[PDB]
Ligand binder design. Structure first.
Ligand code: HEM
Lengths: 560, 666
């Protein structure tokens, strides 16, 4: 009825029923069988032909392909990660010359069909045009699955600065991109000659002192310009593809780059099933409460952005500076103790293991979270075993760009009941956005919140969400107590965001936050809460929470 | 949506937003519950007044009856949507409409019953069951009840008690019109108004301006509720839900003929209610002030709305109303039948009703089909029936058109129509303009009838074939022949079991709304439409419960197959006709052809090639796939080079789904 309401439609965007290929189709296995030589030949023969319905300017569609490649990959926003070359449905201001020219590539996708997506095709056509000009490129990596539903003065210098900084491009990369896309040295020579007749953009490279320094350096040294343009272009097209394990094809370079957030490759033999049991029995008698383990294992695995597929638990970054310094992770609490205890466990295990079986800290954090979940569930009457797939390695400090990780800090985490100052939208909207980023669905988000409440995973262990009298137990008490109409909620006297579900002859119980009551208030979410809050829905809730938790933990596992 | 195609309406209620997950059939769960225990629990929660919403006369019966009526009171025949169905009354604009006031409470009074069962009793079943049980709790034996209303998890895209001027004669026509859109005649409307208003009262009493916002705009401190009254204590003795303060009968917690004896006992004057105004009261000395106060105190006066008084003044209503005032057993009978029709209107055929309370009697408005009285055909006979159909002289265009005409009348909004029943032969559907009788349809019917006679005469025993099966079997045989001509060897699955109804079984009047005003798959842009052709195509596809890939592949198959209306060349982008290929896709995306509106402006376009010749001609439906970005992405999947067998398989799957849409008995 009332507009500006909570939009649950965002959670289930791009379902599996609108996908023509169905659920029996993985793009990786298809594009791994493609022949990039024939693809390059087809792209070139399209490049050197003049379609009658689109006059081929100078008989060479190269620069048009370059423009579409640079325009599909120019909509990447670091603060959110949406958009981008492949991680954003750029299809479905502009002059409409960016999709009518997308029809020029139809004779190429006609041959391949499902073995080559449009997102891969546009970027690869741009790259092949760039290589066909005469320039040589760093490399290319396929694997961009296409979605099926739309989701002169120095003033120009600072405007370009902000516009390119929103794309995670420093000054050298911005200068390289600007000098390249508009190009030999046919640019810097004419630009630095006769001042371009002293009469907008692309001239500020000679005005801004930091830009002018780099440009005048490149004036007599085209080698730096070539290397910097190759690196900047490769960063530009592959910005939102995630870990290096998602790159496919034989054109992917062997080198590893810092902006990809690299993690070391596995060097030892992973843990089997007896060693996993030994670890889960060792860090269940190590003096660590279920709350600490669950909160730590969620802190590492809730820094994942499903748009550009960066973050996650892989790499063991929770032990390193950008992740441990965040307010939400609470360095002033029990994160250092948990990290030190896990390091001690890892050192003890690696020094006494059969053969060359070794466990990594990144793996051990998630294994500890799984062990804590199992212990809590067993302390609730059930007997389960949460699945756990090893194969994580811990990155060192030198491989983590501190500035690049500042955009992953959560301004508001609904699952952990965190809320930082200066938020655009209210508490529930940020929870919805975070759940959408984690590629979660409405039932998965509901069950995950309802479990994390009773597991004591709240920020600073606040009682704002624990709707149960017995913590350290995975039960559906949150739902069955939220739906109870025997308590009358009201805003707290302290005028804060908290509430008060006071009843029982005037007594006050279940002090609740906003992201807690939004589940019982919103009818669409109350439906799911009633599904999980029934009398016989106790084991179904546990199984669903285990499934959601395992899905969240293994979000970043793209190598498997 | 009405200014740009909204493809998200095709994938409404996805499976990823369903908490119960896949492989969960509601029929199995709800068929194994204790109905007696459910009724006992409901009757237990009816008589226990809660302190957060007090009960009038210590009984939640009338509130449950009103909630059940309003849940099933949104059904509309033309679209078919609304009604109980998926229980949209919980999460929709429906929960926040001003005429659904205080019905958000009646869905929380039933929570203690829902939690005791869980997935074994959907909300939609409960909402309409409680009221039904309420009807039995007062002393009125209802017709029956059938569980099985599956529960959805996403909202979809889809009467004045004061007349503005409350003139009973001028409000009777409004009542008749608004009940005509629910397929209720005069006698059923009068029975529903009289019976439903025997139980209960009207709550509105106060300034009527001190009511809070709707639940969709209420603060989270109210926890999903709305209309929080601030006048007085707010709820119970001074609740405000509608504004009018009338108590109809002397015993609003029992069934009796006291509504008629009150309506036809006093003359009525007009007065202003404490909340709002414009209600009728007794005339001579305020009548007799003998009406129970819901929570105790002074007796009220006999009062009626303007809606209720219309039944006395309208000459059509007055005669039957007086007859019921004389004989009450007829009133009870018509009320039972009308209520049963009301709560089960949009539940589909009788094969979907579950539980022990479902009656054994058949009713005309259900469009009954005769029970199977023979052994169905196996696999040896089907392989011979297909050969006989193929060698009967019927071209694939006629067979496909007949099968689609039989099976495209279905609408998933209320699950009526479908290829079952075999009603393409019968009067309401054989004469529709879209099911072109000025052509080769009667010939197809005659050929299928003679094939049926030949097969049944030489029966191998107790195995016989029905015409309803024969239409779909001919469609599948034609598609098999087309695919074999195109080069692929496939076998379209066929599941026999359909039966042929008679002309007395079908109702001609109630099928005037199933007529397709615009069928996107066979162009037929019929006169009198509220939207362009493409939006009507999306509406038709959403009615068939089709997705976007299925709709695209079905359109692209029906074009080249020859299913078009009047066999127009308006959309057949293939050169070799009567063949199942993706030539509608590989030629729609052909960029060497320029599309311009035809000189004879009628909504059709001309596709000229580069040599200045009119190569293809298409319509808005045919050309919307090559222009809309979301749809063009699907066309490029079936329009590729290697995706010929994938296209054929997808088309066969879509055909199977459409044929077996209205098959709930299997
Ligand atoms: C044109 C047709 C009708 C009109 C204009 C009408 C009018 C109304 C109105 C305005 C209310 C609100 C009273 C309140 O909220 O306290 C109401 C309540 C109610 N209606 Fe109707 N009604 C109609 C038909 C029906 C039907 C078809 C049924 C049942 C099948 C029914 C049964 C009830 C009941 C049981 C209540 C509530 C009684 C209570 O809460 O004590 N009415 N009606």
């Amino acid at each position: 009825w009332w507009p500006n309401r909570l939009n649950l439609k965002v959670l289930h965007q791009n379902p599996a029923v609108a996908d023509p290929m169905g659920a029996a189709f993985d793009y990786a296995a298809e594009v791994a069988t493609i022949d990039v030589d024939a693809l390059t030949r087809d792209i070139e023969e399209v490049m050197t032909t003049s379609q009658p319905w689109w006059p081929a300017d100078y008989g060479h569609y190269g620069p048009l392909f370059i423009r579409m490649a640079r325009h599909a990959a120019g909509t990447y926003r670091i603060h959110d990660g949406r958009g981008g070359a492949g991680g954003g449905m750029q299809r479905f201001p502009d002059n409409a010359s960016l999709d009518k020219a997308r029809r020029l590539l139809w004779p190429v996708k006609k041959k391949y069909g499902k073995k080559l997506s449009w997102a891969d095709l546009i970027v690869f056509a741009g790259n092949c045009a760039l290589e066909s000009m005469g320039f040589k490129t760093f490399g290319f990596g396929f694997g961009r699955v296409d979605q099926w539903e739309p989701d002169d003065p120095m003033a120009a210098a600072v405007d370009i600065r902000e516009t390119f900084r929103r794309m995670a491009m420093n000054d050298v990369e911005t200068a390289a991109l600007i000098v390249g896309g508009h190009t030999d040295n046919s640019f810097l020579e004419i630009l630095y000659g006769y001042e371009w007749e002293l009469t907008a953009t692309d001239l500020s490279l000679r005005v801004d002192p930091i830009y002018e320094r780099i440009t005048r350096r490149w004036l007599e040294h085209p080698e730096e310009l070539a290397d910097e343009f190759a690196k900047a272009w490769y960063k530009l097209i592959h910005r939102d593809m995630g870990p290096v394990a998602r790159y496919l094809g034989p054109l992917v370079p062997k080198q590893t780059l810092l902006w990809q957030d690299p993690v070391p490759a596995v060097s030892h033999d992973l843990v089997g099933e007896a060693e996993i049991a030994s670890l889960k029995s060792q860090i269940r008698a190590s003096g660590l409460t279920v709350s600490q383990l669950v909160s730590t294992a969620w802190a590492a695995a809730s820094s994942f952005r499903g748009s550009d597929k960066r973050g996650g638990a892989n790499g063991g970054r929770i032990r390193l500076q950008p992740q441990v310094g965040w307010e939400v992770n609470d360095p002033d609490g029990d994160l250092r103790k948990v990290i030190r205890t896990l390091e001690e466990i890892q050192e003890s295990f690696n020094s006494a293991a059969p053969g060359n079986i070794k466990v990594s800290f990144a793996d051990l954090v998630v294994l500890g979270g799984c062990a804590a979940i199992e212990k809590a569930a067993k302390a609730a009457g059930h007997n389960i075993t949460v699945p756990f797939t090893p194969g994580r390695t811990d990155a060192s400090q030198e491989q983590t760009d501190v500035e690049s990780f500042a955009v992953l800090e959560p301004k508001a985490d609904g699952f952990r009941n965190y809320l930082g100052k200066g938020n655009p939208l209210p508490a529930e909207y940020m929870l919805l956005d975070k759940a959408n980023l984690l590629t979660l669905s409405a039932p998965e988000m509901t069950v995950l919140v309802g479990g994390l409440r009773v597991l004591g995973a709240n920020y600073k262990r606040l009682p704002l969400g624990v709707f149960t009298e017995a913590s350290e137990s995975l039960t559906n008490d949150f739902f069955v107590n939220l739906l109870d109409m025997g308590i009358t909620w009201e805003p707290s006297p302290a005028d804060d965001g908290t509430y008060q579900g006071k009843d029982g002859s005037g007594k006050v119980k279940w002090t609740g936050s906003r992201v807690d009551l939004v589940f019982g208030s919103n009818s669409e979410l109350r439906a799911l809460v009633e599904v999980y809050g029934a009398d016989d829905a106790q084991p179904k809730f546990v199984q669903d929470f285990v499934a959601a938790w395992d899905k969240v933990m293994n979000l970043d596992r793209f190598d498997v």
